[PDB]
Structures are given as structure tokens and as C-alpha cells.
């Protein structure tokens, strides 16, 4: 699993600079929580090679530097960018064939050899009997599932998603987080998800990383993250924590 | 902010020095006050042309201010950072008015009247649509403006092809010489310009809301339909008055607001005033440079030189299968009819007459078909990789670059520069094509800045063509047909070669299916999928460039079909890569075959180039499709 | 071509040469504009119009049986597409200095091809006699420079340069051209009205062709009334002639000059 | 003071469409909740007069059914776009001043008064500097607060907020809701807010209504509606509710 030792930040944007130091777990959920302009979004865009860093470099796989080929990078990392989203796909069920690009490539693809991967993907993301019979303009609950369809079809070694819980309801976010956790438990997948909600993220996480101001605050398990001091430091408002009656993670409430 | 202020001060001091030098060379300084202020100037010849040298300065300043104003208005109304008065059709409608009142008598202020008529017709066609409500939108507004601009351009092209010796005056009017001989122009423009600035000072808050999003504009209670219609009408009226005063210009109103914003002015009225002043300054500089040129060497126009010097500045500052089978069968049978059917008495080739007329029909129809298919594929690929509906094959600079090379060859060397051994001709057109493509590729890293550079180079090519036509060059007609995209020089061997190239390119195309599918809805997601953005974007641009290159090598520099076939194919209900590609290709092929058959047969003696009939057939159907889905 | 009745021309200058030879043209590209502009050689009405000068209709040409399809070298279709229909030759006409010389050369070439040498000799002899006849009519005026202009609009004017078609006539008559500035290879340049103010003792001769309103709008201004060539009585309007012509256009221009400035000083 | 009778949202088929009828309070806080735009969006879009009422009448404070003067309309209601944030702007003061459009009109007589209202607005939103540099240079929270300041200066009798909570942090959500509630208490105007989070609506709204597809499920005061047995039929997921000493309304947690 890749780790970051970079110091650079969004120096030109909003004038912010702060050193970063973080090592992601081998195969555990990593929840990036904090403010909107705290730096988590820019952190994921740095992880996905959206823009080259100015200082330092992100080490991946423990054996190579940042310089990687596109078809080799995407074969191990699936990026859900949320911002600048794919609008008007104009086709359904074919998005998994788009995600399967780094596997079959442009040449020698044979029109997607071994079609078991795409059907396995569209069946494990959700039991849908309406395949190849949808339109691009639908609700977010099915749009997000169609988005994760190609990401699962990639079967890349890492899943980097920023804001899957956005624009979705608690049922759809429950479904998405349960799918992500089931993927991480079955395939041993390393996932890094950005979620605004503290409790909702912690209920389906294991190694949350909190960002505030410009640097990182904590990097502990949800049990130690549920402390009120950490929430106060990362969100400004003073919130409280109490044990959940049936949930694994305790419930936090704002004052 | 030191650089813009320093550049402005340099421009002011250079303009003042040039004006001092020109006015001293024209008249001694000791007789200046007696010449300018005296309404009854002395009978001295050296002192009496000040009655014409002074209005040139005033008309230049007024037209520059008006250009800045219309640029700001077209930037705010359409909500686009780039101003585009010419694409709106106000210039083309004015030219159409000039050429229809130059013939058949009936004179007067033709430019303003016909430009206002074109603006009102566009407004009516957009307000009508398919519903009682106007439901006007900027995208369909710009689309219809481009359509009517191309339509009036084609009517003007037909009128000059049939009558070019009697429109030389119009040619000068289309170059913007702004040479004045009396105070009539200033005395007519200053009251109308005062009314324009008065109407601009009013309704400023509607303009501020139009600059913002339409949602909050309707939330604040502004009648967006009526306000946008009134602002557009005012802009069209001012542009019509300006092009009636001087004519076609080198888009000074495209540099005035950008420089005014780069210097500063956060508010609206300061930005308007600074843009007007900067436009007046640019026109002053261009006018003084033109005066110095005519004093030292050659009488060249003003707007053309303005565009030629602004282009480098801009570069520096920068069911499916069934429908497919149906249209294929339709194309097959229509090719059969065009082969069989004639115009000399509307006879039909019953056999013996078919092989006698085949060497003059088969190459022409086959070249038109190949060019239409290839232009449609190129336009669809461009609109897929860019995502803008205004994208056309001219965006690359291929057709404009080739025509630039041909007109440069015609300018540099005299004589039959088409087939002379000393003249480059095709080789010169090709090398200038490659140079223009390289410049457009190196100037714009992003597709939008590449689009801006391509539009600038197209305007520069239009200015050079108008310069060539303004002078009494006996060749301006010949190349004109080549500019109009005529299938008259088609040859059997050339047909075979372009067919081989076309099948090669259409066999390479399915390999780019994944690219043409992921680049849509892409950006960062495309890079996350596993494809390299730039290494494939330059590849698609080179493919479209080769397509357009062989298209202009076959039919000539035309891009109306390459712009219309993708739009019509999308409005038919096809939005998948290969289906849309094949449908647009077949539609463009059948459209260009129909246009060639019309230009060859609708008038038996006179042969009109296929590029004009392509517009004549596509514009009504396209505006019908637009009103059906407005 | 053995039969002179089926000769087809693709440009107006070959038509003028054919009419000078006396050969009856069988087909002319763009005859309406020809009858509109050129008016000295009367073109018959029974002439079948082929089409545009740049794009002559090939199907109409192959429908009839042309024996010689004379065209202007460098203008029109390719030589192979024209030789596929009927044998012919492209004749040179413009170079940028002596257009009338190569016009006479192409006239002699057309005579030698169509076997009409006697007609060309007679025509050239009549041309030289007509030129020599009007010689003493332009000698009493002296060496005053003559200016050849034409009105484009009430703001510009197309002036003939030192390389125009009417320059050999001016040179033979001992009349220097008033325009001594810029010039193009076809003999015409579009200049401003105020530039003509730099010329004092010049005899400005302007042609009119459907531009009377522009002429009135120009002469109504006080700037034009204060010009040096009009206050001395040197501007007169004369009927328009065909600028890019041959020998008949030259005769027309000579007759116009004789009716204008012939026998003034 | 609004009474809506919506039999059909639109003739073409939507995910779910059903008739309903309800009267909004006069000076209370109304909270519209629902699962994304599956019927919840159409309600406020029709109220904003961006959607035709088909066969239903809408009483504008008991004046008429439809087709009222746009000037008095804008002077009466202040609507916020639904996930369509304005991407244009130059100065915060310019924006809050141009927000006073429907009061003086196009040919506005701004040379007189109306300065005290914009001063009170920019003092209430908490912005100490009167005119900042660029409204887009500030963070998302600051530009959205400038938008709320513009809506305040608009001087409206009704305030329609279409998903202000979305794309915002939880602390920012709490702050914006508290500001809106204090504003409604100050001016005594009806405010209708769209909230994705049920707890957020339970906190700072005195009258929550819920539409599961558009059949009008439940309307009531937070003390009146029992979230335990209601949210299960509202959103499907049988989540629980438990009291918290922070807010009087017991907080809800996902089971």
C-alpha cells in the first residue's frame, strides 16, 4: 500500500502550505474526515496524479516511485473523483466495459474477452434485472451504483473515492459503505474514502485520518477517534460521544 | 498591474507620436489651429483635406468605443468570456444587404437595415420554436446565429460568383478602410452612439444579472427572456451602425474587454469605460499605422491589418442498424439517380449516354461523397473530443490554413500561380497548412484555447481573402470557387487515391472507439480509467487533421457539412460512438451528393460549387430541427 | 479547327479576339455579364451560353461538337479536361507589363491555328492605321500628364497604373501617366480620394458604370469641390470602356480619349 | 401562509407521482425531507414557479392562483437554486447590494436610501469587512453566506432554501441552520428548507414534513412526530432514536 512523505500543498490555491506525513494500512478502510477546504480533497487528488506535487513525492507499492504507466496505475487504483462528474453517459451496462479498459486495452481486446468479470461486477454491486435497459438521467441511488460498477469491474488493488456519501440518502450510503466493506473483506482491498459524516464513516471504517487547517490531526482507530477532544479539534463545534445501543461505533451528537 | 498600465502608456505615447508625425507631414503645424477649428477652412489644398483627415480620427475613436461596448455586451448576454459579433450574423447580414442594394438599384443605409432584419428574424425564430413560451437559451441562440451567418454568407457567395465585377465597392466595405471624405459619417454616428451609450447607462442591473447565472437572474425577478431579447437587439443595432459606418473590422471589441479586465476595473461601468477607451486606442494605433503605410508603401485596409496584428497578440496572451441500412440504401439509390438523371431537358441516361457522361459525373459525385463522409467523421470526432457544440473542422485551422497558403501564394508572386512551375501552388498550400496546424497545436494546450486560436486564424484567413478580393485581381474569382468547395477539378486517379485514404482512415477509426467513448464524460475520470489524456488527444487531433486535409485536397476548404452532420445525427436520436459516427457520415455523404447534384443540375449552364448548395439545403432543415426541439 | 462556326471560347478575351478575326463564336462562358460590361463588339443573341467563366459546363460542351475550345492560360479548367472534349490551346494574356503585346501575340497564334492569318493581318493593319490617325489630335496638348481613374464609391477610386492596358496608347501618343506611385501587375489600384489632392496639373478622366448617385454624393462635398484638378477645369466624365480588353477595347478607349481631350490645347 | 394542492407534478412519468395537499405555517420553520429528488425536488421547484402546477392552485397569501407580477413575486419570496450554485460573481458587497433588485427595479433609485438594510445584512451575517476582494476567492462557506446575505437584503416574506445542507460540512450545516432559525425568529417570516439529514431538520425546524416519493407521509412538530416508528417507513432502513442532553429532540442513529 502506498504511503506519502510529501510536504507540498495547494500553494497557489487559497495560499496554503503544510507538511504531510501518513502511512496507509495494508488492507483496511481509511476514512478521510475534516473540513471541506481542510486538504483531504487535495490529498486524494495528489494521490490520483491529478496534479504533480511541488515538494516531496508519494511512494507506492514500496518498490517504485511516482512515475508509473497509466495502464499499470489504473490496474491497481480506481478513482472516484465526484467533482467534475461523468454527465450524460448515454449508455447503461457499457460503463463496466469502459472500466475494463486497462485490462483488455485498445488492441487485442477481443471485444472484452472473458465476460464473466463484467457480469460478476454488475451482480455483486447490486442484484439488478434491468441491465441494458436504463437511461443516463436517473436518480443518484442508481447513478452511484453504476459509477462503482466499473470500479469493481476494474478489480484494481486500491479504491480511492472522495465523497461517495454526497448527494445520497442514508439508505444509499449504507448500501455503498456495506458494498465497500464487503469488497475489502473478500478481496482484501485497500480503500480510502472521503466522508463528511463522522459517525457514518466510522461505522464502516477502521483507520480514519482527520485533516484540519493544513496538516493532519489524528490517525487512530474509530474507538480512539470518537473522543470529544478530537471532534472538537477537527470540526470546531463542541460535540459529545455516547455508546451506541446496537451499533459497533458509538454515536456522536452535536451540541 | 504594472505591465498593463505600462503597455497602455506606451500605446498612448506611440499613438500621439504617430498622429503628430502624420499631421505634420500632411500640414505644417503653424496652420493647424486655422484648419481644425475653422468650419470654413481655407481653399488651400494642403489645408482642405483636413476636412477628411480629422473625421478619420473621430470615426476611429467612436468605432473603437462602440466595438468595446458591443464586445462587453456580447460577453455579458451570452455569458461567454469571448465576444463574437460576426458569428451572430450581424456582419454577414450587413454584407448581404450591401450586395443586394448594390444591384437592382434601391440604395440607402443597407448594412444597418439588413443586419437589424437578420437579428429580428433570428429573434423571431428563437422565440417561436415549438411552444408559446420563448424558452431561449444561449447555446441554441449561438447555434442559430452561426446557421444564419453561414446562410447569408452562402447567399453572398452566390451573388458574387454570379456578379463579382460589379461588387468591388462592397469588397472595400468588407475590409473596413474607414477612409472618410467628409463629416457626414461622424455627424450620423455620434448621435446614434450617444443614444447607444445612454441606453447602456440605463438597464445596468439587468446586464449584471445577465452576467451571472440564469437561475439567480430569474430568482431576482428579472424577465430574463425580455431583458435578454432587448439587450441582444441593442447589441445588434449598435453593431449594425458600426459596420454601416466602417464595415468589417479586425475584432478590436475582442481585445478591448479582455485588456480592460486585465488592467482592473471590478465594477461594471468602469470596465465599460476602460474597454471603450482601449478599443479607441487600438483603432487609433491601427489607423495611424495604415496612414504611415499608405504614405510610404501601398494602400492597405485597416481591419485586415488589425486582425493580422491581433492574431499573434492573441496567440501570445493565450433501431440504429436499421436506420443506418435505410440511409445507406437511400444514398445508393440517390447516387443511381444522380448518375442517370440530367438537366439538358431532364433526360435520363438509358445506357449509351451513360458512359459518355460518366467521366464528368462519376469522379465528381464520388469525390463529393468521400469529402462529405470524411468531413462528417472529422466533425463528429472533434465534437466528441472537445464537447462543444460549436466545434467545426475549421477549429483545427486546416481549411483556413490551406486557404491562407493559397492567398499568400497569390499575393507573393504574380501570374498563373495555380499551375506555374515556379509557383508552389499545392505544395505551398500544404506547407502553410502544416505550419498553421503546428502553430495551433503549440499555441493552445487546452481544446478551448485551441478553439480560440482556430477562430482567430479563420478570421485572419477571411481578412486576407477580402484583401485579395478588394484589389482588382483577375484571379480572385478562380480561387473563390476553390474556397466555395467545388467538385470541378476531380479526377479518376485522385478519386481512387482519396478512396484508399478514406478506407484506411475508416479502418483506423474503430480502434479509437474506446477513446471516443471514454473522452466523453471524462476529464479526471478518463485519466483514472487507464488512458493517457494528451497522448491520445493529440492523436485524435492528428486524425481529424488528416481527415480535413484530404477533404480540402478533394473538395476544398469547406466545413458546413462537417459542422451540421454531427448536429443532425445527434438530434435524430443517436448518441453512441460508432452509431453516431456512421449516421453522421452517411448523412453528410448524402447531403453533399444532393448539394453537388443541385449545383450541377438545378441550373444547367451555370455550375454553382457544392459548398454553397450544402448550406442552402442544410440551413432550412437545421432551423426546422432547432425549432422542433427548442 | 476546319469549321470556324463551332468555335467555343471560355474567357472574354478569346471572344474579343474571335470577334476581331471575324469568326462567329458558337459558345461563350457567362454571356450576360459580357453583354453587361463589354459593349463595343456586339455579341449575337443566338450564342449558346455555356456557363461560368471559371466553371464551364462540360456536359453542355460534350452535348454539342466544338472544334476548338479556346481558353485563357491559367484560368478555367485543367488542360487535360478540355483536351478530352476538343483540341484547343491555352493562350497567355497577362504578365505585369505589356498586356497588349501578348494580346496581339495570342491573336496571331489564333490566326495561325485556325488558318485565319489574312484576317489577323488586316485587323492589325486597321488597328495601326486607326492609331496613327489619332496621332496629331493629342500632340497640341503638350506633355501634361493624364490620369485614368474610375469611381468605386464616394470614398475611394480605382486608378490605372504604369502597367495598365491603356499605357501603350499613352506611351505612343507621348502622354505620360499622372499616377507615379504604387501599382499592381494587372494595372489597377484602389486609392483614396484625398491622395488625388497631391496632383495639381493633371487631367483626371473618370469612367461611369451605374454609379451616378455615388458621383453626386462625392461631388456634393466641399472637399471634392476644393480639389486642385477640378478648380482648374480638368475633370470631365466620359463613357466607360472595357479595361481588360484587346484591340477593340483599345480602339474604344482611343475614341473616348479623342472625344474627351482631343484638340483641347 | 402558503396552501399547496399538487395533484400531478408533470404529465411525463416521474419515478413516483401522487397527489397531495398541505398548508404551510405563517411564521414557523418548515423542513422538507425526502430521499434525494425522488418527488421532494418537484415540490419546491413548483413553489419556485419553475414547474407548472398542472391541475393545482397555489394561493399566494390568498391573492390568486398563478400568473402574478414577477416584481412583487421576487419581492415576496427569496429562492435558493437546487444544487445549482452560481459560479459568477465579483464582490460580496456588490452581490448583497444587487440582491436588492426587486425593490427599486431596473431603473433603480439607489442614490437615496437602502444602505441601512445592506449594512444591517452584512452585519448580521457576521462579515466584518464590508467589501472583500472576490466573492469566488473566499471558501464555499463564505460565498454561500454571502448568498444568504443577498437573500436577506432581498427583503422577502418567504425564504425557500433548496438543499442548503448539501455539499457542506456537518458543523457548517449546524451553523447555517442556527443562523436561518435566528433569522426566521427575527423577521417573523416563513422559511422552508430542504434537508437531507433528518437530525438536522429535527434540530432547527418547528414543522417537519416528509414525502417518500410524493404521497405525503408525515407532518408534525419534532415533539409530535415519533421518529422511531416513522423513519422506518420513511426511508426503509429501520434506524433507532435515543435522547441526548444536547438538544431537546432525541437524536437518530442508524441501526
Author numbering:
A (entry chain C), D (entry chain U): 11 to 265
B (entry chain B): 6 to 323, 348 to 659
C (entry chain D): 32 to 296
Question: What sentences appear in the manuscript?
Answer:
As one of the most elegant biological processes developed in bacteria, the siderophore-mediated iron uptake demands the action of specific ATP-binding cassette (ABC) importers. In the periplasm, a group of soluble proteins named periplasmic substrate-binding proteins (SBP) are generally responsible for binding the siderophore-Fe3+ molecules and delivering them to corresponding inner membrane importers. In this study, we functionally characterized the ferrichrome, a hydroxamate-type siderophore molecule, importer FhuCDB complex from E. coli and determined its structure at 3.4 Å resolution by single-particle cryo-electron microscopy (cryo-EM).
To understand the molecular basis of this importer, we determined the structure of FhuCDB in LMNG by single-particle cryo-EM at 3.4 Å resolution. The overall size of the complex was ~130 × 100 × 80 Å3, with one FhuD on the periplasmic side, one FhuB in the membrane, and two FhuC on the cytosolic side. However, a unique feature in FhuCDB was the single membrane subunit of FhuB, comparing to two subunits of homodimers in other known subfamily members. FhuB had 20 transmembrane helices (TM) folding into two domains: N-half with the first ten TMs and C-half with the last ten TMs. In between the two halves, there was a central translocation pathway. Based on a tunnel calculation using the MoleOnline server, the FhuB central pathway was open to the cytosolic side and closed to the periplasmic side, indicating an inward-open conformation. The movement of these residues effectively deformed the original substrate-binding pocket in FhuD and allowed it to be occupied by two loops from FhuB: L5 in between TM5 and H5a as well as L15 in between TM15 and H15a. In FhuCDB, three residues in L5 (F167, D170, Q171) were directly interacting with FhuD residues (N64, W68) via hydrogen bonding. Specifically, these four residues: V165, F176 on the N-half and their counterparts Q498, L509 on the C-half, defined the narrowest position in the pathway, which was then directly closed on top by H169 and M505. Below the periplasmic gate, residues along the path could be grouped into three types: hydrophobic residues with mostly small side chains (A96, G150, L151, L155, G158, A159, L494, I512), polar residues (T91, T92, T97, Q100, S154, N161, Q162, S179, S421, E423, S487, T488, T491, S513) capable of forming hydrogen bonds, as well as Met residues (M175, M495, M492, M484).
